[PDB]
Design an enzyme around this catalytic site. Sequence first.
Site, short mmCIF file in Angstrom:
data_model
loop_
_atom_site.label_atom_id
_atom_site.label_comp_id
_atom_site.label_asym_id
_atom_site.label_seq_id
_atom_site.Cartn_x
_atom_site.Cartn_y
_atom_site.Cartn_z
N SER A 178 0.84 -1.18 0.00
CA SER A 178 0.00 0.00 0.00
C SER A 178 0.88 1.24 0.00
CB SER A 178 -0.93 0.03 1.22
OG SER A 178 -1.88 -1.01 1.16
N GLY A 179 0.41 2.29 -0.66
CA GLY A 179 1.00 3.61 -0.55
C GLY A 179 0.35 4.42 0.57
N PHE A 200 -2.02 6.21 0.24
CA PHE A 200 -3.40 5.83 0.03
C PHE A 200 -3.40 4.75 -1.04
CE2 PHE A 200 -4.53 7.47 -4.15
CZ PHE A 200 -3.48 8.34 -4.40
N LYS A 212 -1.84 0.93 -9.30
CA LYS A 212 -2.33 1.47 -8.04
C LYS A 212 -3.84 1.56 -8.14
CE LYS A 212 -1.37 4.99 -4.58
NZ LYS A 212 -0.36 5.98 -4.09
N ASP A 255 6.83 13.38 2.77
CA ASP A 255 6.98 12.08 3.42
C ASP A 255 8.25 11.40 2.94
OD1 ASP A 255 6.52 10.13 5.19
OD2 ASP A 255 4.89 9.16 4.11
#
Length: 286
Positions: free
Chosen positions: A14-15, A17, A35, A125
Site C-alpha cells: 500500500s501507498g 493511500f 495502483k 513524506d
Amino acid sequence: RVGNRYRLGRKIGSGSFGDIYLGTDIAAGEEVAIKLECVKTKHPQLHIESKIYKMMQGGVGIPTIRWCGAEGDYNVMVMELLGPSLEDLFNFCSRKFSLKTVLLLADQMISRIEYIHSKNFIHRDVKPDNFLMGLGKKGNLVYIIDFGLAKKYRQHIPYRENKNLTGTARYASINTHLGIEQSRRDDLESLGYVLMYFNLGSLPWQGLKAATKRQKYERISEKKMSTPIEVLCKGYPSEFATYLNFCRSLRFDDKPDYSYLRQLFRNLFHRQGFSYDYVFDWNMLK
Ligand SMILES: Nc1nc2ccc(Cl)cc2c2nc(-c3ccco3)nn12
C-alpha cells in the site's frame, strides 16, 4: 482486465493511500505497477496524484505513468514497474550500508528532492519506503514515489502552524514536531535523518516506551529535540552533522543550497577514494 491491455496481478503493498499491485502490460510484454483506489472513497486522491506524476513526466528518477482511468469499483493508475525500496534493500543488507552506498544514495536523493521542489511541490513524506531503485537498465537510478501527501508550496505559501503530522514521525523535522507548516527545508532535514538511519541501523527515537498514540508522538519529539546532532552523528563523518545543521538553520521560505549539500558529500566521496560506479552494497550479494 484493466484498461483493455493490462492484467492485474497480486497485491504487493500500500501507498499513503490506495493499494499497489503487480500487473502485466499484455500488449507491450512488460511488467507494470498498478495502483488502485476505491471509487467511492470519501477523499478521492488517485486522479490528483496522477496529475502530479504527469506534470513530472521526464524528470530523472520519477516513475512513468502509462495509464489512468476507472475500472469497476476502482480508480486505476498504471505505472512502469520499479525495483525494491531502500528499506527493503537495507533489510536485505542486514541493516548496514557501507559509507560508499550511503553517499551514492545521498547524491541522488538530494537531486530527486531538488527536482520536486523545482516543480513547486514539497513531498512531505521523505522516508526509505518512498525511494525505489529502478529495474534492469535503470537499476542504478534511485526513484522517488508517492505524492499522496505532497503539497504545492508556491509566491511562497504563508508561515502557518498547520498542526498534526501527515508524514512519518521517525523522519519528521523538528519544525514539523512543533506544528509548523512543512516547506522545502523539511524534506531535506528528513533526508538527513534517513541518511543517519542508514549509517546507524536505527535512530535514537525509535522504540520509545509509550502507552497511547499521542504519548508515542510526544516521546519521539522530545527525544529528537534533546538529541544534539553531534551526538546523533558521533562516529560518522562530519558531513552528516554539517548537513543536518544546515537544514535546521534554513528559514521557512529559503531556497536550500542543494549544490552545496551535494558537494559536501561529493568532497567526502572523493577524499575516501571511492569510485562513482553505482556499485551499491546489494549489487555485491552473491
Ligand atoms: N515495485 C513498485 N513499483 C512502483 C512503481 C511506481 C510507483 Cl508510483 C510505485 C511503485 C511501487 N510501490 C510499491 C510498494 C510496495 C509496498 C508498498 O508499496 N512497490 N512499487
